[PDB]
Every structure is written in C-alpha cells, then in structure tokens.
C-alpha cells in the first residue's frame, strides 16, 4: 500500500548526485558547490562531509565493500574517499571534460565514468585505478551509465545524441544502439532489476519517459505528464512502480503495469536532479536531490 512519509529532508546547495548506503542508514549527496555530505537519515545527523572541490560534483556513489565513496566533478577529476576517516584514497583526472555519471560494478573492482568527452571509461581499483578501456561511439555528452544488474558484464550509456548504447566489457563496439526518438537527448537510463522483463527506461528533456525491451529494441510505452526536463526515471527494485523527477519540481510515481501516474509530489525544493532507491528496499526508501536540498521518503 502506497503511503508516503517524509523521513528526512534538509536544505543545501543544489544536489546533483545522491546514493544510499546498503547497510547503514546513510545517504550521500553531491553538490553543485563542490561539497559532498553523508547524512544518517534516521538520526538526522551528518556522518561526514567534505569540501571536495570548488566545481560541481555531479556524480557520487558508495563503494560499501571498500568503505569508500567515489565522486566525479566538473574539474575533470574522480576522487575516492574513505567515509570512516575522511581520508582521500585516490585523486586523478579521468576525462578532459565534465563527468556526468559514475557506476560501480556489483562484484568486480570496476567503475564506469561517463563524460562530456563523448566516452565511457572503465577503471580498475585492483590495478591502481588503471584505465582498462574507453568505450567510444557516442556523439554528444554521455549523461548516464548503468550496469545491467542481471548481467553486469554489460552496461548501458545514455547520451544527448538521442541514443542508448549497450556495451560488453572487453568489446570495443556496442552490442546495439537504441534510437530513442527522444529528440532532445537522453538524460538517464536504468534497468528493471527483476528477471521477468528485459526492460530499460530512458528520460529526456523532451518531457517523455520511455520503456524499452532490450531483446527486441522496441518501445514498450511512453509515459507523459511532466512539464519540464525529465532528469531521471527508474524502476523501483521491489515495488511495481517507476519513479521519475523533473525540472518541473515534481516527483511522479507511476504504476509499472498500466504506466499510469499514481501520485505526483511537489516537495517544494524546486528542480529535481537525481534519485536513489534503497538497494534492499529497506522501508521502501527513496531519496531525491533538488535545487534546494534533498529528501528521503519511505513509500510505505
């Protein structure tokens, strides 16, 4: 039963990245101001925060099994910090242009970064953060990268060139390129995590969200209702819903069978930029970052 409760919300500078820790009740936010924050959303006290840089930090993920966070910023750098001590673990120039998105492999010591330099890069932390591969082919900014959780030897990249490319690690060309028909670009791509559907979802400045069958490459559905750029759309990992967020200031919760909107939320933090869902669905938590702060919600 959908019963949305605000578990914790705080104001800050614009939140561009956000992520949940899988075992501590913590959320990481990465800010346009160069600051990152880790909050305990149950006690409502900061665990740790760092002034990383003076440029925006658009991307940040926990790497829980190593006690790290990894972040990427407009100064072209990837940094990794130990969240227990604050210590900086590594600091390197990853691309010659902004970093939009970082994904962490669930099982292997790999990280993907996607950038305005038109590539995705694969880094290996068990090989001194060596660059192991550069995936070339996109023709505008790479806005989003995400591993297929059912087969993390493959990953999807979403691009302002209006395509999604799906790639295999260790192979230089995409397995396939999806021509989205989202003419203003793709801001975000996400996989449905369960084995019953081979689905991906994309979000666009053209105000649409689209569901794809990645076996047949067909568009299964198009979800309309947002009134400004759609920054993200994801499938909830346990509940039968899709969650999206937009520069129109709303989050929307859509029924994932009927693709109809169930609930529209204006949390009143202005434009929405990023999303995370709790990996194990603890309290069905989701969190979103906005112009004016973040919010952590229990969906029921």
């Amino acid at each position: 039963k959908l019963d949305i409760k605000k578990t914790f919300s705080n104001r800050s500078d614009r939140v561009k990245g956000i992520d949940f820790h899988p075992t501590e009740p913590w959320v990481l936010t990465t800010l346009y101001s160069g600051r990152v924050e880790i909050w305990n959303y149950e006690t409502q006290v900061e665990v740790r925060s760092i002034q990383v840089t003076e440029t925006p930090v658009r991307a940040g993920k926990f790497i829980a099994r190593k006690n790290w966070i990894i972040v990427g910023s407009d100064d072209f750098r990837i940094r990794v910090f130990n969240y227990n001590t604050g210590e900086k673990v590594v600091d390197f120039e990853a691309h010659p242009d902004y970093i939009r998105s970082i994904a962490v492999h669930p099982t292997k010591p790999y990280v993907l970064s996607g950038s305005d330099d038109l590539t995705v890069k694969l880094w290996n932390w068990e090989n001194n953060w060596a660059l192991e591969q550069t995936f070339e082919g996109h023709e505008h900014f790479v806005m989003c990268v995400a591993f297929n959780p059912k087969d993390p030897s493959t990953f999807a990249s979403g691009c302002l060139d209006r395509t999604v490319k799906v790639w295999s690690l260790g192979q230089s060309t995409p397995n396939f390129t999806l021509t989205t028909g989202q003419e203003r670009g793709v801001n975000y791509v996400d996989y449905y995590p369960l084995p019953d559907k081979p689905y991906m979802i994309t979000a666009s400045d053209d105000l649409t969200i689209k569901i794809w069958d990645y076996q047949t490459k067909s568009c299964v559905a198009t979800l309309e209702g947002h009134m400004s750029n759609v920054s993200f759309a994801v499938f909830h990992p346990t509940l039968p819903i899709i969650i999206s967020g937009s520069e129109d200031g709303t989050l929307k919760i859509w029924n994932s069978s009927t693709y109809k909107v169930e609930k529209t939320l204006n949390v009143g933090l202005e434009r929405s930029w990023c999303i995370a869902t709790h990996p194990t669905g603890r309290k069905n938590y989701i969190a979103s970052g906005f112009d004016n702060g973040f919010t952590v919600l229990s969906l029921g």
Partner: peptide, 5 residues
C-alpha cells in the same frame, strides 16, 4: 555549455 546546471 549545454546542461550547465
């Protein structure tokens, strides 16, 4: 820059 914000 596109997508500056």
């Amino acid at each position: 820059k596109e997508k500056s914000d």
